[PDB]
Structures are given as C-alpha cells and as structure tokens.
C-alpha cells in the first residue's frame, strides 16, 4: 500500500534561501572528543596512585573567529583511591582549548575576565609546564620570541596534538553538599586519542601526571544519540 510515500505532501523545492548554511559558522567536535566519551587512567599524587575517570558532556570547539567565553569542553572527573582506601571524589569541570589567535600558550594573551582569571599562573610557569611535553618542542622547532613564532601557526584543529587547560568548577552529585584550586595542563593526541597532563597549584606539590587512555567498550558496533540546546 505504501502509506508514507504516497501521502507525503512536503514542499520540496530546490531553491536558495536568504542565508545559506555555508555562511553559518558553527562549531565542531573531533573523533575522541565526542559528547559521550569515557577516558580512564591513573594519577600520581605525592607518591601514591589514584584511578581517574573522565566522562565528557558537551564539546563546543570554536573556529577562525572566537571572542566568546563559552567553555570549549565540559565533563565529570572522578578520582578514586588505588593504593589506599580513599573515597571517590567526583567533580564537574570545564575546559578551554589553545588556538593561536586569542588564547595563546602563555597566560598573557588571555583576556582579563573573571571567568578566565582562574586559568592564569605566570609566563615562566606556563613555559616550564609546556616545555615538559615533546610535542610542544616538535611544534616550535617544526618569551616574546615564542609568541612571535606562535603568531604564524596554522589551524589548530588540523594539527595532530591539541593543547588545552582543565579547571574543576564544582561537585557533581550535589553542588552545595575545595581541593581543586589548581588547573591541568593537558595535551591530547587525536590519532590514538590519549590524554597526558600536569596539575598545577601554588600551595601544593608540583608536576602530578595524568596519562589517560580511551575506555574500550564491550561492543564494536556503535550507535549515536544526539542533543541540542535550544
């Protein structure tokens, strides 16, 4: 009978609208930075080891022009004991990527805003924590000198490695019901999709590693859900 074909009355027309979707400059996400993606690893704090799980929630990665302070990445980070019997502490965190137009490597090109003032430490500390990574060095061999060299970089989404900063905002189960005053220097590799990083706070121990990896599922076939803020 084919009810849904012969009864279709949609106004099909191959015309052109007033504004074409090519003019719409939307935001994208990558392969391993999808909304529902889980990462698993450890963390060496002091001398002890903890198990760290990361569940992403919203991924909103900008493009050529970005003068907005909406967070690029968002998720839940949970740290649980591995050596000791430490209870699980899970938090909601947000994150900003490093594109070499507005948000540079050093925390001096970042604008003076109350939401961005928690990601800033010192240009010297930033240079140390970034020179620890080998991909940073391979980027800059292909203080004012590194920024001048940074000004001619290509698109950051077409490069294999993405540098970013992570900051825990509050507690996830109940916000009302603070040992997260520092922030994470994060490098993410897209091809293998793994995350390394350091945790920085002034009144704390220095250079605590992260070393995450994607969480393998129990079914190789994958299906996709979606959502969109109205």
């Amino acid at each position: 009978r084919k009810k849904y074909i012969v009864e279709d009355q949609s106004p099909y027309s191959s015309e052109n609208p007033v504004i074409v979707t090519s003019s719409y400059n939307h935001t994208v996400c990558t392969n391993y930075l999808r909304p529902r993606m889980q990462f698993t690893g450890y963390q060496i704090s002091g001398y002890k080891r903890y198990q760290v799980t990361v569940n992403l929630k919203t991924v909103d990665l900008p493009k050529k022009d970005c003068t907005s302070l909406s967070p690029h990445l968002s998720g839940f980070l949970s740290i649980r004991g591995l050596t000791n019997q430490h209870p699980e502490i899970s938090t909601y965190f947000e994150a900003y990527a490093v594109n070499h137009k507005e948000l540079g490597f050093l925390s001096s090109s970042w604008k003076d805003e109350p939401v961005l003032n928690e990601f800033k430490a010192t240009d010297q500390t930033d240079l140390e924590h970034w020179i620890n990574f080998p991909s940073f060095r391979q980027l800059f061999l292909m203080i004012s000198r590194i920024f001048s060299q940074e000004k001619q970089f290509d698109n950051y989404l077409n490069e294999r490695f993405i540098f970013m900063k992570w900051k825990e905002k509050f507690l996830v189960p109940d916000a009302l019901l603070a040992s997260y005053d520092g922030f994470y220097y994060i490098v993410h590799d897209q091809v293998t999709g793994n995350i390394q990083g350091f945790y920085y706070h002034q009144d704390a121990e220095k250079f605590q590693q992260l070393e995450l990896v994607p969480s393998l599922k129990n079914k190789v076939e994958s299906s996709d859900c979606s959502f969109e803020f109205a």
């Binding site: 074909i5 003019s23 939307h26 900008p62 968002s74 909601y92 190789v220 859900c225 109205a230």
Partner: protein, 622 residues
C-alpha cells in the same frame, strides 16, 4: 502589482529630484594606507560633514518619500551608488531628528535582507555611535524605535555567527553595555509603574536576553545579581493568576476581546529564562530552583486549557497565548537534558502526559478527526500558526530519550505510541520533520526491539522511503540538513543490531548510491551536498558497522565469577565468510576508491576514520 511599480518609480523620482540640489555639500578628507578619485572611501571610520536641508518642505518630503521607498524598492539603483551612500552618511549628522532617523533606517536595511552583507563591519562601526546618540532624543517619531533596531542587529549576529558578535564587542569597549544594564536595574526598581514603564522594562528585558543568548560572560554577569530571578518568578506568577482569574469567570462573560496586558512582559521573561538555561553551570548551580520548573508546567497547562475552553474570545486573545506555549516549551526542552538536575522533577510532575494530551489534539495534529460537537472551536481557532509548539514538543520528547535505558523508552512508547510520531513524520514545516527524525534516531539507538517495531510499522519499504527523502531535501537549509543527518544516523543505528540487519542494509542499492554520491564530494565538487564532513563521517560509520563484529575481531586478532573471558576470546567461520562476502560486495560496488579519496581528504577526522576503515578492509580481503 503595476501600481507598486508606479509608486516606486515616483518615490525614486522624488528622492532624486530633491537630493540633487544639496548633493554638492559632500566633503570628506581621508587617508588610504596602501587623489580626486573615490577609491578607498570604505576604509576609515570618518563620515562626511553635516549636510543641512534649509527648506523645511523639502526635508519633510525627502524624509517621508525615502521611508516609503524603503518600504517599496526590494519588491522591485540608489542603494549601490557611492555618492548617495556618502550623502546619507553626511545626513546622519543633521539637525532635524526625522532626517537622522530616516538615514539610520536607510543605512541599516541591507544587513537584514541582503546576502553576505553582515561581513561589512566597518560600516557598522561607522553607524553605531549615531544610533547610541539616537537613544537620547526627546521628540522621537512613531516609526523609529532604537530598542528594536539594536535588538535586531544583536539577534542577527547571534544567529549568523554565534561565536563572534561584533556589536557586543564594540559596545563593551565603549562603556555602553554597563549603562544599559544600570538602566535596566533602575527600571526594575521604580516605585510607581504604568503602561509606558512596562513597555520600557519589556524592551530592556528583551535586549538583556539578547545579550546572553550566545555568550557566557554576560550570562554570568546577569546572574551575579541575586534579585533578577525573584522578579522573573513574580512575573510568571502574575500571569498565572491573571489566566486563572479569566478562566474562573468564563460563564459570566459569555467576539473581540483585548489580550492580557502583560503578554509581552512574560514573553520577555521567558526569553531570559531560555537564554540563562542555555548553559550547564547555571543549570547545575543557579537555576536549581523547583519553583521555576513548576511555574513553567503551570503556564503550559493553563495556556492549553485556555485554548481548549475559552475559544470565544477571538484570535487576538489567543495568538500571544500560543506564542507563550512555544517559548515555554523551548525553555522546558532546555531543562530536560540528562546532565541537568531537574530532569527527574519534570518526569515526576508529568511532562509526558501534557505532551501526549497536546500532540493528540486535532488543533495541532492534522491526522486527527475533528469531533462533531466542537466545530465552533475549529472555526474560531483556525489561521493561527501552531508549528513551533509541535516542533518544541518533539524537541522535549527527543531530549527525554537521550542516553537512557530501554525501560524509559518502553514507558514513553506505552504513553506516546509510534503511530503519533509517524503521523508527525510528514509535516510541511521542516522543523517538525527534523525534530521527528532526530527523535526516531534517539529512540532506535542501542535497542533491537524499537528497530523491530519501526520495521513492523513500515510493512519492507522503509529504506525506499529514506532514500526518497535523501534525494529531495535541500542541504542549503539547516532544518533539512538536520533531517538528513537524522536519517543517516537512523541508518547507522539500524545496521548495528544483528547480522540480519546488516544483510538488509547491504541488500539495498539506492543507499549505496547515496553513500557513493556523498563520499565523492570534494573541495571542487561541493555542489550536490556541499562537502560537509558530518555526512561523510556518518557514511564511514555505516561502512564500519557493516564490517565489524565479534567473530571478525576474534579471527583477526587471536591466534558472579570474578574472572570472565572477553567476548573477543570466546560458528564464527560462517559469520566470517559472510563478512568477507560483504567486503567483496563493497569492493565491487566501488566504495574502496572513495575511501582512498577520503584518505586524501582535507579534514583530519575523516582522514583517520577512513584510514582505519581502509586498513580493516585490506586485512579482511586477504
């Protein structure tokens, strides 16, 4: 139609006759950074000197004729002449208020009608200080509203480029936004109010909701004040009490009736609520209140029972109510996302029952039969658009089924069956079709039984229906592209269930042709689809799902109880040769060369996904 042409010609003749007498007062001394030519005039922030029309009748005639010409000329030149543009730019600094206002209206019209005009930000920077000064004039004409024009510009730049708004950045540096917010806080604190103060406060609420629609900075700066949400709740409560009082006296009143006086006030408050709810941190910390959710549900129920009962009041009384229903459903579909704390609250207070009652009504559902005792309601309520209500209701249902177990899906399908969604699958509005396709994609995800139900409803020809849909939706419109992505991900979720579903998908020939036409698009061949990477990723995901399962993994990798074996380590030969036959069919169709051409693709995600798929197919072939 001919009289419109005659009127346009006459008004253009009037403008040219009057403006040619004062055309010699244009004088601008500028610098081009690379003499009597006019090259490089659009590279400075300076505008020519003040041009004054001494004759009063000539100024009145020019102003009125140019306003009607602005009304007329797009249906049928003077806009593109550089001399006339410089003449109007010089008229911006005149002494007559009508001349300045009509110049502001003349210069800002192409930004809303012309295509690719919004890239001209230098003209916007030249124009905006005079609009800001036009806020400050005591006798203002009835045809000029600076609030409407500023709001229209900000909404235009929010809709086109959400990540970059030039107007907000050029108003923040010049101390204007702080003045606007201070005046809003002063208007909200007046001790005595009338209709004019309500209209001023409504315009301020609209422009403040336009500030925070796509920027977290102004969102948090507005939520820094602790008394804004109290006033929002007060406005919603006031409208609920007014609606309830009108409902309680329907028998005594019972035809043109005036609308409720604060419909614009409540609409603007709901616009702020939606813009605030568009961020996750505010949903988890600041908008945690249950009072907001219960007020939204009460507004929805009261407005629906107004449309059900008091239909004698006319269309002028009901159009604001249906607009309020649409905006409230938009706010609700923002609050019901899974990682917000209020989702179980809306489940517990019955949002699905309200949506099911609203969707089965013949007023909204055109596949329902009008009952033979409510013909007067059908006569009275016809002509009012109800597409946004249906689109937002399907948006709520789509957000309910995002990342949930099958028990909730079966509960919703017990309440709202599949036949209603399939009634809404062929709406003439593209938003309704897009939301229906995304809802079906969310439903079919990770569940075999829903896929079997959808196949049983299409007793198959579902693949023919999807292929027919894919060949006619225009990918230059965003709702049709959204529906296309929903169709492609329905195909993704359908082929990742069993071996029988993979056989059914690969038996079709039109879907493979659609995939081959999507994958062949490149930088120079972006005509049929537009070289969109999302469609390529969906097609690669279908091709990955057709060739990946546990037996192939065990063959190509290998050589309670507290310790169980993995599913890849544990009949497999038949599945393996079936998968190899599928790979050979895919090679014979010709998608292998397209996968190589997508190795040589610009974007990185398609490159890596195609590389993994090509390596897997190469290892399966041998």
């Amino acid at each position: 139609h001919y009289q419109d042409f005659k009127m346009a010609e006459s008004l253009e003749h009037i403008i040219v006759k009057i403006s040619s007498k004062y055309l010699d007062q244009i004088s601008l001394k500028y610098i081009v950074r690379l003499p009597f030519d006019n090259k490089g005039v659009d590279c400075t922030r300076a505008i020519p000197k003040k041009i004054n029309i001494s004759n009063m009748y000539d100024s009145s005639l020019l102003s009125l004729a140019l306003l009607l010409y602005l009304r007329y000329h797009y249906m049928i030149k003077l806009r593109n002449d550089a001399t006339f543009k410089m003449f109007v730019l010089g008229l911006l600094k005149s002494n007559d208020v009508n001349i300045r206002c009509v110049a502001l209206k003349f210069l800002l019209q192409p930004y809303f009608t012309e295509d690719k005009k919004w890239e001209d930000t230098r003209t916007l920077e030249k124009i905006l200080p005079y609009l800001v000064k036009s806020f400050n004039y005591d006798p203002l004409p009835w045809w000029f509203d600076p609030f409407d024009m500023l709001d229209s510009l900000i909404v235009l730049y929010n809709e086109i480029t959400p990540m970059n708004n030039p107007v907000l950045t050029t108003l923040a540096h010049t101390n204007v936004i702080f003045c606007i917010l201070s005046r809003f806080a002063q208007c909200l604190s007046l001790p005595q109010h009338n209709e004019a103060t309500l209209k001023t406060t409504t315009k301020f609420i609209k422009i403040c909701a336009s500030f925070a629609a796509s920027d977290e900075k102004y969102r948090l700066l507005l939520l820094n004040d602790t008394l804004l949400l109290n006033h929002l709740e007060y406005g919603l409560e006031s409208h609920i009490t007014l609606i309830q009082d009108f409902i309680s006296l329907k028998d005594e009143i019972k035809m043109c009736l005036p609308p409720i006086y604060d419909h614009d006030f409540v609409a603007a408050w709901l616009l702020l609520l939606k813009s605030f709810s568009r961020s996750v941190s505010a949903l988890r910390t600041t908008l945690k209140r249950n009072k907001i959710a219960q007020l939204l549900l009460q507004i929805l129920s009261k407005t629906y029972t107004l449309t059900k009962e008091c239909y004698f009041a006319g269309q002028d009384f009901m159009k604001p109510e249906i607009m309020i229903m649409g905006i409230t459903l938009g706010s609700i579909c923002n609050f019901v996302v899974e990682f917000s704390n209020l989702q179980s609250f809306m489940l517990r207070n019955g949002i699905i029952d309200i949506i099911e009652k609203m969707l089965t009504d013949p007023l909204f559902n055109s596949k329902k039969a009008w009952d033979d005792n409510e013909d007067e309601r059908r006569i009275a309520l016809q002509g009012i658009p109800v597409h946004e209500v249906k689109a937002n209701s399907l948006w709520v249902l789509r957000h309910l089924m995002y990342n949930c177990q099958n028990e909730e899906k079966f509960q919703l399908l017990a309440k709202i069956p599949m036949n209603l969604i399939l009634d809404f699958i062929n709406d003439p509005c593209w938003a309704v079709q897009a939301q229906c396709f995304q809802l079906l994609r969310n439903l079919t995800c990770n569940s075999r039984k829903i896929v079997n139900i959808l196949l049983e409803k299409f007793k198959t020809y579902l693949f023919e229906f999807l292929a027919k849909k894919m060949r006619l939706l225009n990918p230059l419109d965003t709702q049709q592209k959204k529906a296309m992505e929903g169709i492609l991900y329905i195909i993704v979720n359908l082929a990742a269930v069993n071996e029988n579903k993979k056989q059914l998908v690969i038996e079709q020939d039109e879907i493979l042709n659609i995939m081959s036409e999507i994958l062949v698009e490149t930088t120079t061949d972006s005509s049929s689809y537009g070289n969109d990477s999302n469609l390529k990723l969906a097609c690669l995901w279908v091709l990955n799902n057709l060739l990946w399962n546990s037996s192939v993994s065990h063959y190509t990798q290998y050589a309670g109880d507290e310790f169980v074996r993995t599913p890849a380590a544990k009949s497999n030969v038949q599945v393996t040769r079936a998968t190899v036959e599928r790979c050979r069919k895919l090679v014979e169709v010709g998608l292998y060369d397209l996968v190589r051409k997508n190795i040589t693709d610009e974007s990185l995600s398609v490159r890596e996904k195609a590389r993994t798929l090509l390596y897997h197919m190469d290892l399966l072939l041998k």
